[PDB]
Amino acid sequence: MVKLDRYIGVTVFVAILAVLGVILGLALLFAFIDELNDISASYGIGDALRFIFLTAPRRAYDMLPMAALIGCLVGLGTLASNSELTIMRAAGVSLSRIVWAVMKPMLVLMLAGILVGEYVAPWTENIAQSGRALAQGGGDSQSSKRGLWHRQGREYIHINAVQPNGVLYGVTRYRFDEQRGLESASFAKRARFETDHWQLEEVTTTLLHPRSEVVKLPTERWDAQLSPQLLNTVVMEPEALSISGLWQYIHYLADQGLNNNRYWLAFWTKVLQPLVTAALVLMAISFIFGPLRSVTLGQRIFTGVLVGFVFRIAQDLLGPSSLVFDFPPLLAVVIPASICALAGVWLLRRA
C-alpha cells in the first residue's frame, strides 16, 4: 500500500500547494485593490506593493487551512474525476485508508506551516505595518486606529502604539504649569521599561521660556502605574503575536491578575490548527466522496467551500460566546472539531 499512498499523497500535496497559490494571489490582489484609498502623495503605489508583499508570508499562513480543505478536494476530485477512486475502492481499499493517505500531506503542510507562519509571519508583518504606518502617517503625535490617552497629575500623555514587548511608540509628554502655561511639550519615538522606572529614547522636549533641547536617552519621572489593564486595552490583537508570544503574554497578564482568555483561545486555534483542519477535511472527504454517484469537480469544490465557510461561521460565533460565559478555552476549539470528527466517522460508516 505504498504506491497508492505516495500517489494520492503527491496529488493532494501539489493540489494544496496550487490552491494556496491561487487563493494567496487573489487575496493580495484584493488587498492592493483596497489599499488604493489611502495615498497621501508621500508614498503610494510603491509603498503599497511593499506593504502587500511583506504581508504575503502572513496571509499564506491564514490561508493554509482553507487551502488544505480545498486542496484535498482538488486532489481527490481530480482522482475521482477520472474514475480512479471508484475502482480503487472497488478492489478492497476502504475509504478510511484514502482519508489517511490524503491527511498525511496535510499534516506535513500544517505542521510545517505553523512554524513557517510563526517564524516568518510576525517579522515580515512587523516590518510591513511599521513601514506602512510610518510612511502613511507615522512619526505624527497622532496615530490612527487606537492611541492611548492618559493623565498623570498635571501631565498629559498620548501613545501612538503600544507594542506587546513592553515598548511604547510615540510618547507625548504635555507638562503645563499650574497656570496652565506650557512649560514643556515633548515627544519620544520609543520607550523602554526597566524595573523601577520608565526610560524614554529619542526624546525631543521644546519650550521657549527664560531652549529646544534634544535628549536621546532615558528620562525617569513617571510614578504613575500606567496599569497593565489600561495598556491591555491598547495592545494589538493576538493575530500578529507569535505562538510563544501568546504563551508568554497569557502568562504575562496571569501574574498581574488580569484575565487572559482571548489569548488562550487564539493560542489553541494556533496550536491545534492541524487537528481542527484534519477533522474538517475528514468530514468533508467523507460527506462529498462518500456516495458512489459521480459528482463533477466544480460541485465537489463548491460544496466543500460551503462546508468550510459554514464551520468557519460556527467557530466565529462559538468563540466569543465561549468566553463571554467563561468556559475553558480548550473545549471551545475541541468541541466543534470533535463534532466534525464524529460526523465524519458516522459518514464513513454510512459509505
Partner: protein, 351 residues
C-alpha cells in the same frame, strides 16, 4: 418567441432563487451583528427588526446584480449541459440574439436595481439614520461619563472633562486636542479650561463654551508655539452613513457628484455583468456547471470593490467626474467584449 419567454423565465426564476439565498445569508450575518450590538449594550432591543428592515434595500441593491450573474451562469449552464443550447444555435440563433434575449431581463433587473438604488437606499439609510441618531443620541452614551478622554473615529480630536451637570450641558476641567483636516496647518491645537458649558441642538450636533482657558497651536517637538490668553471661547464640535441622504444632483460638492455616479453606476454594472456572463456560461464540455461560480463571485467583487476604490479616490485624488467610473465600467466592458468576440475573431480572421 417561445425561446424568449423560455430563457427569460428560467433566468428570472434562477436569479430569484439565488438572490433569495444570498439575501437570507447577508441579512442573517448583519442580523447577527445587530442582535450582537443589541446584546452588548442593550441598544434598541425591540426595533432591531425595523433596523434590518431599513438595511434591506442597501443589501438587495448589491445582491441583485450578482444574483443575475450567477443566474444566467447557472441557467445557461443547465441549457448547455443538456444539449439544449447546442440544438438552439444549431438552428440559427446567433450569440448576439442570445445576448439580446438575455439582455431584456437585464433591462428589467436594471430598472429594479435602479429605482431601488436611487430611491430605497437613501430612504432606508435615512430612516435608519434618524432612529439611530435619536436612540443613539440618548442611548449611545455619546456624552462623557464624565470619565476622561473621548476620541472621534480617526483619533484626530480628543475632548476631556472632569464633570457633567444636571443639564448635562456644563463642564469643568476641559482639555481638547485636535488636528485640522493634513499638510496645511500641520500643527496640533490644544485647549485647557476651568469651566465649560455644552449646548446641544435639537437638530443635532453640540456647541460648547469654555471660560478662562488657553489655546495652543504648535507641535510638541518643533519649538514653534503660540499662546493665546483668552477668557471666553466658544467651540462648535461636529457630530457624535452621512452621504446617503437625498437625490440632490451633482452640485459644487464633488462628494455628491461621486455618490450620484455610484448610485447611478449600479444598474450600468448590471448591464456589464450581464454581458460578461453570457459567453462565460459556455460549459458545453459537460464537466463543470459549478466551476465558474467562484470566479464569477470573486471577479464581481473585483468589480464592486475596485469601483468603490476609484469612487473613494474621486474626491481627494481629483479624478475628473467624466473619467473614473466610466473608466471602471469601460474596463469590465472591455472584458465582456473580448469574451464575446473571441470566436468571431477566429472565424473572421480565417475568412
Amino acid at each position: 418567441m417561445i425561446v424568449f419567454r423560455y430563457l427569460s423565465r428560467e433566468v428570472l426564476v434562477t436569479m430569484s432563487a439565488v438572490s433569495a439565498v444570498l439575501l437570507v445569508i447577508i441579512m442573517s450575518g448583519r442580523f447577527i451583528k445587530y442582535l450582537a450590538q443589541a446584546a452588548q449594550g442593550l441598544l434598541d432591543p425591540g426595533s432591531l427588526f425595523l433596523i434590518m428592515a431599513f438595511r434591506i434595500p442597501g443589501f438587495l441593491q448589491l445582491i441583485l446584480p450578482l444574483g443575475l450573474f450567477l443566474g444566467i451562469l447557472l441557467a445557461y449552464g443547465r441549457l448547455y449541459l443538456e444539449s439544449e443550447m447546442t440544438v438552439l444555435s444549431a438552428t440559427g440563433m446567433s450569440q448576439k440574439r442570445l445576448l439580446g434575449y438575455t439582455m431584456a431581463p437585464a433591462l428589467l433587473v436594471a430598472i429594479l436595481v435602479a429605482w431601488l438604488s436611487l430611491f430605497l437606499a437613501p430612504q432606508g439609510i435615512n430612516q435608519f439614520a434618524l432612529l439611530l441618531n435619536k436612540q443613539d443620541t440618548l442611548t449611545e452614551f455619546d456624552t462623557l461619563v464624565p470619565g476622561r478622554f473621548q476620541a472621534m473615529r480617526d483619533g484626530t480630536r480628543v475632548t476631556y472633562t472632569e464633570e457633567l451637570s444636571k443639564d448635562r450641558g456644563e463642564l469643568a476641567g476641559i482639555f481638547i486636542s485636535q488636528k485640522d483636516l493634513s499638510n496645511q496647518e500641520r500643527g496640533i491645537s490644544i485647549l485647557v479650561a476651568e469651566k465649560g458649558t455644552q449646548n446641544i441642538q435639537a437638530d443635532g450636533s453640540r456647541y460648547l463654551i469654555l471660560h478662562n482657558g488657553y489655546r495652543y497651536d504648535g507641535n510638541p517637538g518643533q519649538a514653534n508655539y503660540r499662546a493665546i490668553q483668552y477668557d471666553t471661547y466658544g467651540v462648535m464640535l461636529p457630530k457624535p452613513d452621512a452621504v446617503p441622504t437625498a437625490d440632490l444632483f451633482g452640485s459644487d460638492n464633488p462628494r455628491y457628484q461621486a455618490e450620484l455616479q455610484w448610485r447611478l453606476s449600479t444598474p450600468l454594472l448590471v448591464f456589464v455583468v450581464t454581458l460578461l456572463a453570457v459567453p462565460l456560461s459556455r460549459v458545453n464540455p459537460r464537466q463543470g456547471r459549478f466551476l465558474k461560480l467562484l470566479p464569477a463571485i470573486l471577479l464581481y467583487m473585483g468589480y464592486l470593490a475596485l469601483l468603490i476604490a476609484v469612487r473613494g479616490q474621486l474626491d481627494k485624488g481629483k479624478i475628473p467626474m467624466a473619467i473614473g467610473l466610466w473608466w471602471v465600467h469601460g474596463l469590465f466592458l472591455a472584458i465582456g467584449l473580448l469574451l464575446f468576440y473571441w470566436e468571431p475573431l477566429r472565424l473572421k480572421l480565417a475568412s
